[PDB]
Design a protein around this ligand. Structure first.
Ligand SMILES: Nc1ncnc2c1ncn2[C@@H]1O[C@H](COP(=O)(O)OP(=O)(O)OP(=O)(O)O)[C@@H](O)[C@H]1O
Ligand SMILES: Nc1ncnc2c1ncn2[C@@H]1O[C@H](COP(=O)(O)OP(=O)(O)O)[C@@H](O)[C@H]1O
Ligand SMILES: Nc1ncnc2c1ncn2[C@@H]1O[C@H](COP(=O)(O)OP(=O)(O)O)[C@@H](O)[C@H]1O
Ligand SMILES: Nc1ncnc2c1ncn2[C@@H]1O[C@H](COP(=O)(O)OP(=O)(O)O)[C@@H](O)[C@H]1O
Ligand SMILES: [Mg+2]
Lengths: 454, 1411
């Protein structure tokens, strides 16, 4: 039954298929490592090992669906019938397909979660009360004998720095080699050859950029060979994108697949933007660092809003570091060419909301919301609240670049992000995010019902 | 080997590459060789290649030619460095340019703005723009013989740049000294005046911006606008273009200043001034070419000072300036600009305008155009430094998309890094820092290309402001209200009308309306009237009837406003040519106005609406109106190939041979007789709109008006040479040609059914040769339109095979009635008026019957006879004139016993005589005839019978397939083309007309029938046909390829139904009498066998329908097969009795009918017993079971019923002999196999017996066929499986014919792999053989030798060869598992189904599996 559920998972998307040898290896890993008896302890260990092996190959929705389906499959054979009736009643309430009070100790907390409209808490109820283990990236790479890893993610989200952190924690040198041109293809070929003959990690960015290499070169590379040379701490990585064109399926089948989720910490991404900026230019620090701070905040609130597809925007847009760079150079130019310090913030607002950040956008309401965000960020007033928690003072006329940089870093550091960062900080109604959570819950529960009805 | 002297005579004798080198050298010596000192390095290469060419003129020689080609390519690559504009030109174009004395017309490709070079006494003085503007150099360049081509090209380019700079400096000096623009506009080019006006505007706005005042310079620029608008009408054409393209910029200046004046705060004004483009001038730098830079939203770009001429200038809108600022922001950091959105938003035009505004000519690419031209153009742009505009970039092919995306990524990487050299096309090319790359999109950009660009989305621009300022340019009093009205109308037109694929109402059609309004506003005056008339003349021709109603209603709603000589001329032209209405008048006026305003139209509508009548009558009205001598050409495009249409040059030699369209254009351009001063020449292309055929005239249809030929020649199209396209639908048409060319849409018929009936009769009398006037009045009075309209409307209720409208069959009716009445001319002088009226009415009645009821069933024919008679069944006229019946004309025939097996013998029944007589009547009317019906009904048979027994027509034997007729016709006709006989006409028997797949040959038949002639492809001449007719026979709706109505409309359609039960009984009664003359003692039983046969046939037809199994089709051909089998049994048997006869009939009926069955065999046994009991109550009949009826001649010298034991013992002995001599298979021998092999042997003994076997795998069909073939002494042939199939078929035919080898061909389902093989065996099995599959002459002479060893004309020779190849050839088709699509196509194919006998071996039953 669980193999049928995983095959139905593979039916939904190209990246979610499984093989059979992987399933058998995961099954034997149950025994290679008392629930009132010994056979039920074996069954519990089997479920936990299978879930921790096949949970990291999915996004949040598919892994949460798998967790709740596995819990239902456990309970519907060990627990009594009224438990199944209550579970289906509450799931039907979750998907807005069935109505009725459940027949009533952990289910009391589940009902409290459901009546409070905290749907991710209802999923955490499954994932915590049943499963007592979770696997991260290091757990996946440590607990696999394979040498190929596919780490896919949505656009405007990258986990290359995560692999860099892992390599630094593993005392192993990571080589980052992007693709995009035939020179990049030649560099990738020579680098992967040097790695295969000598050693050292290689990570390729966006092989989907070289999907031609996927069908011809990579297919002849990975499929036409056995397991590589058993070097010490030597592995090969690869990343892709979930929302684009499908890659070759056998290459997916011959490698361990990992799906990396986002890091939508708004204060965290403000810190990430601020700490990677080496401030230099004609305007040292009198206003360039302040404008870069405002631009880092603006890029943070605009790259976090694009994660909420039906509510934050009207379409899944993608904003990246190049947009930040062009906005930065525009701010540098307008600040350099207007030294009277009566800075025309209207010019910056219009040029950001029409050309720099309004270029790729098509709909009018999304232009409106980007204009609203830029007006809130680049208002250029004496005192402004970038969020309801932080107030930013304008630079005074008696500081250097170092003092202002330290002051802005201190203003960033003492901030603590609240738990409603996706609601309070992006200036969104709580009703809209509650409706988005409800729609997510309905989709998840309907998928669970469709899985369990077959 | 030919004769060498450059020029080569009789080239059709490595040689291909050699003569390609010969042609390239012919061009090279004709341009450089025979103009030479203008390229010294190329002269040295010319001498070296001359040595090599004289050496060759063979592997070393071929290597030398390849090295010479590489040397020429390397010489061009060296011409890149020192010049880089040849990349807009091909290799031969570059060679002829380096070959400016007497050379021009290529500078438009490499520059983009100039048209011709002005010369004076071997010295360059200036260049002329495309739009006629005159450029004057600062210093005249003296041209000498020894200067290199690149040298004077470079000095000309630098002189153009410096002259533009000097004229701009002088213009700015004049403007700053108070001289007004309308004095300096008459001296210098438009670019210099434009740049000076822009710089002066920027300076004045900036100077008045330092304080708060705007009204002074606003009033100044308003007065300057008014002055230019007043000076516009009093200027020449080039000055008119200058004033217009400057007044648009002055409107832009007024718009910007008016927006700045309305700003409440100075900060808002500074914002808006930063948003608008600015033009400054540096007065410190000494370098002249960089003295002007570009300011937009703070960023800076540099001018390049390239000549632009006076191109079409985009109207300045806020969206346009936002796009300009986006491109500025992208190009500041050396990126590129990417545009996307819906189509018709102005992406290519905003890129062109942004490049134009900086004084640099952008390079625009269109996509649909291979990789090589893209790479060459990119290299040229990156070397020059121009800008890259990839239009329809999403439409490019994926491989070239990846290649050009890699190239663009390399360009952008070089621009970001600032590389001095770029590595493109495997060469280190210099990369200028002034280059740019722009892409426009309608999907999205690839991500590797998306990362390096700035995607920007535009909507439809402010068409209101565009139209307002365009109307303001031409001088309308109320531009804004008219612009709002017209843009509102275009929006409502795109919203309310139907979603037809050619209804385009974007900005391009609005621009076309504004462009076309100019001659009309000059002729009628400004206001709402001129714009509404231009809107009508542009939009009305392309709308449908309800579309026209919506158009009329809305146009009357929004707009206030609501030549009799040309009406008289159209009426006179229609009366002279015999044509004959409100809709016809409206379409005539519409076409008149398009041909007044547009130079190229397409004609489209339903088939037979009067498109040819419309354009012919308007051309005749043009002849009588304008006084011009009119010549008209009508061309069928698809009958000829595209290469034959537009000039066939053999790629082997690259030698030009003229085409018919090429010859027409050469005659037009030459103008030998000088009659072209008052001659308008029309070429009408009357076929469907193939995009491949029509895209060769893309420049011809557009404003270029120049014909592009493959060899490089450029023949111009004069304004009086207009091209028409007659088609039926807009399915396979791109919107580019739809908006590019005017479209006239015939939504419905023009009616005039009363007026239509006269033109047919009048041209019928005109085509011929006291009583004539009387007969004309009688026919006209009998043609009462009141009754005829009701009859025509009631005729639609009948079912029509090959459904053609009632308006499109009146040609057949009128022609047949007139021919029948003319045929009785000599017997009209001695009869009363009443009998004449009755005879004329009856003949018209017959013609109307055979026209409006031909394509219907016999029951439907009788129903229409009854209804029309109330508005006889077999009425006729016999030789005074009297009324008689068809039944009295039936003759009697008594054939021999052995004359049954001849397939060419028919038995004349009532329907046979009726069909033969009407076939003669329609054939003598010179009208095409198509007979439709179920297979086996007798279409081909009745045509062969009607054609062989007549002394007025001859037979041409042509066989068709999926893939000619005129090839055999060349051997029967004489060249005008005439029949070889001087008495009998010739008629084209074209069988299996559904077989060609979609079609050229059907349009060739339409050309032969409609225009009565064809164009000779190798001679490019028109030949007229005198006495050739065309006939055919198929059933389209039951074919497992429907035809265009444009072909079947010109031919008469009659339905040929199955013979009735009484007719079948009579004909096979005569057949039974013929075969019973062999045994005369049983001649009294002829009627019961005939009635039993026809009853069994109709019972099997009703019972075993095709709804059960696909191959369950029964046709009266099976009855002829049964009679032939009975004759072969009787002739090869001993003295029989009544029991022997009834058992033979039962066995043969079982074999013919039941062998297709797999329960069904038990049902057939019951049916056979029932028929025997009902019709033949004879004593001890029996022998109706499968195992009770065993007939064979394998045991003795004669055919007789056998016992089981001797048969099985003999077959076991023969099978053990087979195993000891042939291949050994462990076969178990059972009763069903014995029954099967008995039926196979009885099928194989029959002359021309072919067969196909259906059954499950490992049932043993092939092994039993091989065994019976060895038993029957035939020669086995196994296909060792298109060229191989063709050669094995030819080997089989040749071995069967020249050696008299009786062959059995076993073709399995695994042998066929493509539809070509299926078509080949379909052709081979339809008739006796396929002669299509010096070899023909060798076969003919060997045929003559064989015939003389064992007839003079080719007809009798061909018939004898066909009989010989039919008698000694048998083919067996092994097919299994009919569920396969290929197997089902093979079984259901009409050609293979009819000739072969269907055998379903089926699956094993319980009993047979038991033993
Ligand atoms: N006043 C009229 N009203 C209707 N039909 C007319 C009239 N005058 C002539 N006709 C006939 O109508 C026919 C219409 O033929 P038309 O050219 O429209 O046919 P088609 O199949 O659409 O195209 P084409 O013949 O160019 O291949 C003319 O051939 C002519 O004989
Ligand atoms: N400023 C303007 N004034 C008038 N017409 C314009 C202007 N800008 C764009 N257009 C119209 O836009 C059309 C260009 O179509 P476009 O959207 O570029 O399609 P494509 O990208 O396929 O070439 C032109 O036909 C022109 O009529
Ligand atoms: N009136 C008739 N008299 C004799 N035979 C007929 C008649 N009508 C049809 N047939 C039979 O129909 C068959 C011809 O049908 P068809 O397939 O149209 O011609 P063909 O067999 O030459 O292609 C002949 O075999 C003939 O025996
Ligand atoms: N009496 C039999 N009936 C059916 N199949 C047989 C019999 N005897 C032998 N066979 C098998 O049938 C094979 C030949 O069958 P064949 O006619 O080639 O198949 P198909 O009917 O698919 O063409 C032999 O290889 C043999 O093994
Ligand atoms: Mg035939």
């Amino acid at each position: 039954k669980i193999f049928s559920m995983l095959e139905k998972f593979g039916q939904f998307h190209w990246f979610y298929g499984i093989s059979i040898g992987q399933f058998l290896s995961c099954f034997k890993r149950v025994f290679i490592k008392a629930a009132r008896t010994r056979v039920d302890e074996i069954l519990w260990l089997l479920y936990q090992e299978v879930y921790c092996q096949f949970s990291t190959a999915l996004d949040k929705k598919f892994k949460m669906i798998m967790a709740m389906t596995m819990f239902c499959l456990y309970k519907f054979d060990i627990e009594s019938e009224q438990y199944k009736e209550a579970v289906l009643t509450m799931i039907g309430v979750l998907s807005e397909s069935s109505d009725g009070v459940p027949k009533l100790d952990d289910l009391r907390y589940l009902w409290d979660y459901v009546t409070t409209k905290s749907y991710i808490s209802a999923l955490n109820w499954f994932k915590n009360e049943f499963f007592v283990d979770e696997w991260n990236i290091a757990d996946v790479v440590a607990n696999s004998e394979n040498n190929y890893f596919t780490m896919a993610s949505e656009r405007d989200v990258d986990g290359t720095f995560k692999l860099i952190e892992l390599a630094k924690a593993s005392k192993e040198s990571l080589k980052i080699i992007p693709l995009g041109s035939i020179e990049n293809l030649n560099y990738a070929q020579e680098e992967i050859s040097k790695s295969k003959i000598e050693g050292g990690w290689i990570l390729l960015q966006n092989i989907q950029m070289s999907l031609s290499w996927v069908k011809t070169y990579l297919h002849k590379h990975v499929e036409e060979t056995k397991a590589a040379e058993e070097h010490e701490k030597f592995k090969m990585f690869m990343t892709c994108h979930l929302t684009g064109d499908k890659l070759p399926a056998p290459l997916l089948q011959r490698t361990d697949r990992v799906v990396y989720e986002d890091i939508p910490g708004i204060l965290d991404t403000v810190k990430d933007l601020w700490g990677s900026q080496f401030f230099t230019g004609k305007i040292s620090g009198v206003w360039s660092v302040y404008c870069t701070f405002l631009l880092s905040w603006f890029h943070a609130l605009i790259t976090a809003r694009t994660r909420l597809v039906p509510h934050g925007f009207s379409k899944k847009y993608y904003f990246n570091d190049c947009d930040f760079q062009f906005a930065s150079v525009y701010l540098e130019n307008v600040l350099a060419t207007n030294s009277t310090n009566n800075i025309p913030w209207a010019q910056v607002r219009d040029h950001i909301a029409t050309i720099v950040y309004g270029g790729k956008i098509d709909e009018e309401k999304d232009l409106e919301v980007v204009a609203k965000l830029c007006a809130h960020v680049f208002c250029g007033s004496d005192n402004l609240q970038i969020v309801p928690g932080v107030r930013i003072p304008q630079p005074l006329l008696q500081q250097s670049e170092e003092e202002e940089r330290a002051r802005l870093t201190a203003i960033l550091s003492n901030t603590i992000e609240p738990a409603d960062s996706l609601s309070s900080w992006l200036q969104l109604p709580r009703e809209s995010i509650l409706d988005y959570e409800r729609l997510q819950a309905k989709e998840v529960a309907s998928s669970t019902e469709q899985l369990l009805q077959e | 080997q030919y004769e060498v002297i450059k020029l080569v005579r009789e080239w059709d004798v490595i040689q291909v590459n050699w003569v390609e080198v010969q042609f390239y050298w012919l061009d090279l010596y004709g341009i450089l060789g025979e103009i030479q000192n203008f390229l010294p390095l190329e002269t040295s290469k010319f001498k070296s290649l001359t040595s090599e060419y004289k050496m060759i003129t063979f592997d070393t020689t071929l290597k030398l030619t390849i090295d010479s080609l590489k040397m020429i390519k390397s010489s061009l690559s060296t011409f890149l460095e020192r010049f880089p504009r040849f990349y807009f030109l091909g290799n031969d174009d570059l060679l002829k340019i380096i070959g400016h004395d007497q050379v021009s017309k290529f500078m438009k490709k490499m520059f983009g703005s100039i048209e011709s070079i002005i010369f004076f006494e071997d010295s360059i003085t200036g260049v002329r723009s495309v739009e006629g503007e005159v450029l004057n150099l600062n210093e005249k360049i003296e041209l000498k013989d020894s200067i290199q081509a690149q040298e004077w090209l470079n000095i000309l380019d630098t002189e153009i740049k410096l002259s533009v700079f000097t004229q701009f400096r002088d213009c700015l000096g004049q403007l700053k000294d108070g001289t007004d623009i309308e004095v300096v506009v008459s001296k210098y080019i438009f670019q210099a005046i434009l740049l000076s006006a822009q710089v002066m505007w920027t300076e004045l706005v900036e100077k008045c911006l330092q304080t708060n005042e705007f009204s002074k310079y606003w009033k100044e620029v308003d007065m300057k606008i008014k002055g230019l608008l007043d000076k516009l009408n009093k200027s020449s054409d080039n000055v008119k273009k200058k004033i217009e393209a400057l007044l648009v910029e002055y409107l832009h200046f007024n718009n910007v200043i008016g927006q700045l004046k309305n700003c409440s705060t100075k900060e808002e004004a500074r914002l808006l001034w930063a948003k608008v483009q600015k033009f400054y001038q540096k007065n410190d730098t000494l370098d002249d070419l960089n003295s002007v830079f570009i300011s937009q939203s703070g960023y800076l770009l540099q001018y390049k000072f390239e000549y632009i001429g006076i191109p079409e200038r985009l109207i300045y809108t806020p969206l346009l300036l936002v796009g300009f600022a986006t491109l500025t922001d992208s190009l500041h950091q050396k990126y590129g600009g990417c545009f996307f959105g819906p189509a018709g938003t102005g992406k290519t035009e905003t890129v062109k305008a942004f490049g134009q505004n900086l004084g640099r000519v952008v390079v625009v690419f269109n996509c649909d155009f291979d990789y090589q031209v893209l790479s060459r153009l990119l290299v040229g742009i990156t070397q020059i430094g121009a800008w890259g505009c990839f239009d329809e970039f999403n439409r490019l092919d994926e491989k070239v998309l990846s290649a050009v995306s890699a190239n663009i990524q390399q360009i952008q990487n070089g621009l970001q890094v600032g590389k001095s050299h770029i590595t493109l096309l495997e060469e280190e090319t210099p990369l200028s820092p002034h280059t740019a790359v722009f892409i426009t999109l309608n999907s999205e950009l690839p991500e590797n290309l998306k990362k390096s660009f700035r995607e920007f989305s535009m909507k439809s621009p402010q068409s209101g402001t565009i139209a307002e300022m365009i109307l303001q340019i031409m001088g309308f009093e109320d531009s804004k209200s008219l612009a709002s009205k017209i843009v509102h109308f275009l929006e409502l037109l795109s919203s309310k009308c139907s979603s037809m694929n050619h209804y385009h109402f974007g900005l391009r059609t609005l621009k076309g309306v504004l462009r076309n309004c100019s001659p009309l506003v000059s002729e009628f005056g400004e206001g709402e009237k001129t714009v509404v008339e231009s809107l009508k003349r542009v939009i009305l021709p392309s709308l449908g009837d309800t579309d026209e109603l919506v158009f009329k209603d809305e146009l009357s709603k929004i707009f206030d406003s609501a030549s009799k000589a040309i009406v008289q001329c159209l009426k006179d032209a229609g009366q002279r040519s015999g044509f004959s209405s409100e809709e016809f008048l409206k379409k005539c006026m519409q076409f008149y106005y398009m041909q007044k305003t547009q130079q190229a139209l397409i004609l489209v509508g339903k088939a037979g609406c009067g498109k040819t009548a419309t354009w012919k009558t308007v051309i005749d009205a043009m002849a009588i109106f304008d006084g011009h001598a009119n010549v008209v050409y009508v061309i069928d495009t698809k009958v000829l190939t595209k290469e034959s249409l537009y000039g066939s040059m053999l790629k082997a030699t690259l030698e030009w041979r003229d085409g018919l369209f090429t010859s027409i254009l050469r005659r037009v351009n030459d103008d030998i007789t000088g009659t072209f001063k008052n001659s308008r020449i029309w070429v009408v292309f009357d076929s469907d709109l193939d995009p491949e055929y029509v895209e060769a005239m893309n420049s011809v249809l557009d404003d270029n008006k120049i014909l592009t030929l493959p060899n490089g020649e450029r023949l111009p199209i004069p304004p009086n040479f207009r091209i028409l396209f007659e088609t039926d639908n807009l399915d396979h048409t791109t919107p580019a040609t739809i908006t590019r060319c005017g479209l006239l849409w015939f939504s419905t018929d023009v009616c005039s059914i009363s007026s239509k009936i006269d033109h047919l009769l009048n041209k019928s009398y005109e085509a011929l040769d006291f009583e004539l006037d009387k007969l004309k009045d009688l026919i006209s009075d009998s043609f009462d339109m009141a009754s005829l309209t009701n009859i025509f409307t009631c005729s639609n209720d009948l079912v029509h095979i090959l459904g053609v409208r009632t308006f499109n069959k009146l040609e057949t009716a009128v022609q047949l009635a007139v021919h029948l009445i003319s045929s009785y001319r000599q017997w009209f002088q001695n009869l009363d008026d009443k009998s004449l009226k009755d005879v004329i009415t009856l003949l018209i009645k017959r013609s109307l019957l055979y026209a409006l009821a031909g394509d219907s069933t016999g029951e439907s024919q009788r129903a229409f006879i009854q209804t029309i008679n109330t508005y006889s069944d077999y009425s006729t006229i016999v030789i005074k004139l009297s009324f008689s019946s068809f039944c009295s004309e039936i003759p009697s025939v008594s054939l021999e016993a052995h004359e049954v097996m001849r397939p060419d013998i028919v038995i004349p029944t009532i329907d046979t005589i009726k069909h033969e007589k009407i076939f003669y009547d329609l054939l003598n009317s010179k009208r095409g005839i198509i007979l439709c019906g179920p297979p086996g009904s007798g279409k081909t048979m009745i045509m062969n019978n009607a054609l062989r027994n007549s002394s007025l027509y001859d037979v041409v034997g042509i066989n068709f397939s999926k893939d000619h007729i005129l090839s055999a016709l060349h051997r029967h006709t004489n060249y005008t083309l005439l029949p070889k006989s001087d008495i009998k006409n010739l008629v084209l028997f074209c069988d299996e007309i559904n077989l060609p797949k979609l079609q050229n040959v059907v349009l060739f038949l339409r050309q032969l029938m409609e225009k009565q002639g064809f164009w000779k492809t190798p001679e490019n001449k028109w030949v007229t046909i005198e006495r050739i007719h065309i006939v055919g026979a198929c059933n389209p709706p039951t074919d497992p390829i429907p035809m265009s109505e444009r072909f079947t409309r010109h031919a008469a359609i009659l339905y040929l139904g199955y013979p009735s039960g009484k007719s079948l009984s009579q004909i096979y009664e005569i057949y039974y009498k013929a075969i019973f003359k062999l045994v005369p003692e049983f001649r009294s039983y002829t009627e019961p066998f005939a009635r039993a046969s026809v009853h069994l046939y109709n019972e099997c037809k009703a019972r075993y329908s095709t709804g059960l199994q696909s191959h369950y089709l029964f046709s009266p051909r099976e009855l002829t097969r049964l009679v032939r089998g009975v004759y072969t049994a009787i002739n090869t048997g001993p003295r029989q009795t009544l029991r022997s006869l009834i058992r033979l009939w039962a066995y043969e009926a079982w074999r013919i009918f039941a062998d297709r069955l797999v329960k069904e065999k038990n049902s057939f046994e019951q049916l056979l017993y029932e028929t025997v009991d009902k019709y033949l109550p004879n004593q001890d009949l029996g022998n109706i079971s499968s195992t009770s009826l065993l007939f064979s001649g394998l045991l003795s010298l004669d055919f007789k019923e056998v016992n089981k034991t001797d048969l099985v013992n003999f077959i076991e002995e023969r099978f053990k002999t087979f195993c000891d001599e042939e291949l050994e298979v462990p076969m178990v021998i059972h009763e069903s196999m014995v029954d099967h092999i008995l039926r196979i042997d009885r099928a194989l003994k029959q002359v021309q017996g072919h067969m196909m076997l259906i059954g499950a795998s490992r049932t043993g069909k092939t092994i039993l066929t091989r065994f019976v073939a060895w038993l029957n002494g035939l020669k086995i042939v196994q296909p060792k499986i298109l060229s191989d199939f063709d050669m094995i078929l030819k080997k089989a035919i040749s071995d069967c014919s020249l050696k008299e080898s009786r062959t059995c061909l076993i073709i399995d389902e695994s042998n066929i792999l493509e539809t070509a093989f299926l078509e080949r065996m379909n052709t081979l099995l339809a008739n006796a053989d396929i002669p299509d599959l010096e070899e023909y002459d060798k076969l003919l002479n060997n045929l003559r030798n064989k015939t003389r060893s064992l007839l003079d004309t080719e007809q009798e020779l061909y018939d004898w060869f066909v009989g010989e190849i039919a008698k000694n050839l048998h083919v067996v088709f092994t097919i299994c598992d009919p569920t396969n699509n290929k197997s089902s196509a093979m079984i259901s194919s009409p050609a293979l189904f009819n000739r072969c006998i269907i055998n379903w071996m089926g699956d094993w039953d319980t009993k047979t599996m038991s033993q």
